[PDB]
Amino acid sequence: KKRQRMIEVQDELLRLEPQLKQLQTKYDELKERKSSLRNAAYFLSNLKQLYQ
């Protein structure tokens, strides 16, 4: 029964292992996108003010 328990715990571990990676990279890329777009909005507004 402990050997079966090995089977399910290892299966759960190997299933959950990849799940972290895509979520981590998605969080990182969305945070970078948010920062970049906020900066870009700031610069476009500021340059529009300069032009006006």
Partner 1 sequence: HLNFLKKRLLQQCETLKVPPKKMEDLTNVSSLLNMERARDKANEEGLALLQEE
Binding status of residue 21 toward partner 1 by CB under 8 A: no
Binding status of residue 2 toward partner 1 by CB under 8 A: yes
10/35 with CB nearer partner 1: 10
Beta-carbon contacts of 18 under 8 Å, excluding residues fewer than 6 positions away, are none
**Collapsed DSSP state (helix, strand, coil) of residue 52:** coil
Instruction: Give the shortest CB-2-to-partner 1 separation in angstroms.
Output: 5
Binding status of residue 15 toward partner 1 by CB under 8 A: no
Binding status of residue 6 toward partner 1 by CB under 8 A: yes
